[PDB]
């Protein structure tokens, strides 16, 4: 439960040597995707900006625009995602997800339910400086129903602080979620949105335990994962994130590689955003709840330079 990633700062880092290497890998009608992914995955996101700054000082060109020119396919999407500054990454995926009626609710649910309060505050600020409107206004405008209000509650980042576990508030909270669960989460939705949204993590931990001592079900067992709307998919993600954020994103990666096709966008988004936060913890929860290494599944579900960089980011 000590959070650590798989990509740290490259020791003995030279911004100008790395910038010259990337230019050599691209100048002249030729290819060198190996030299690109070898250097990019081995450098921290902060170092990847220092190289991008030295690349412009040395040659007066935009490193990202040149990489976009020389690469294509899923390998291009992974490289440009590795290039986006970590401070701007989450706000960039949300802005690209709020696309009107074609909004990707999976991206909104994944980021908003799995990010800490201190991370959400930085996203909201960054969103307003890079883009015109605010994140909350863009969410309200492109979503509706109690799924909208559930996101707006979480976007406030005003969850109760972890305090002394009131054993008397636990039984009442667990009894309230039971009645709403027995009505398929369709009766007075405002009541449990406040509980899932504002109660502290340690409290809702013990509330979820008292759920299994009251009913025979776990909280997740009363919500189907496949036949599920936006709200119930958000309850599932908030519950799993309250239990363990590394374990939730681990199951997010697992189902991105099972289906008629591999969700390469979710695969890229989850591994890039968490590469320096908790990817090492995500890998261990993967080996636990799925009886296989994340390295094993990526190798068997991806091809080419796109796969080689993913494996290097994994470990």
UniProtKB/Swiss-Prot annotation:
One of its GO terms (biological process) is negative regulation of apoptotic process. S-nitrosylation is induced by interferon-gamma and oxidatively-modified low-densitity lipoprotein (LDL(ox)) possibly implicating the iNOS-S100A8/9 transnitrosylase complex. GO terms for molecular function: calcium ion binding; calcium-dependent phospholipid binding; phosphatidylserine binding; phospholipase inhibitor activity; phospholipid binding. The modification N6-succinyllysine is found at residue 288. The [IL]-x-C-x-x-[DE] motif is a proposed target motif for cysteine S-nitrosylation mediated by the iNOS-S100A8/A9 transnitrosylase complex. A pair of annexin repeats may form one binding site for calcium and phospholipid. It is linked to Pregnancy loss, recurrent, 3: A common complication of pregnancy, resulting in spontaneous abortion before the fetus has reached viability. The term includes all miscarriages from the time of conception until 24 weeks of gestation. Recurrent pregnancy loss is defined as 3 or more consecutive spontaneous abortions. This is Annexin A5. It comes from Homo sapiens (Human).
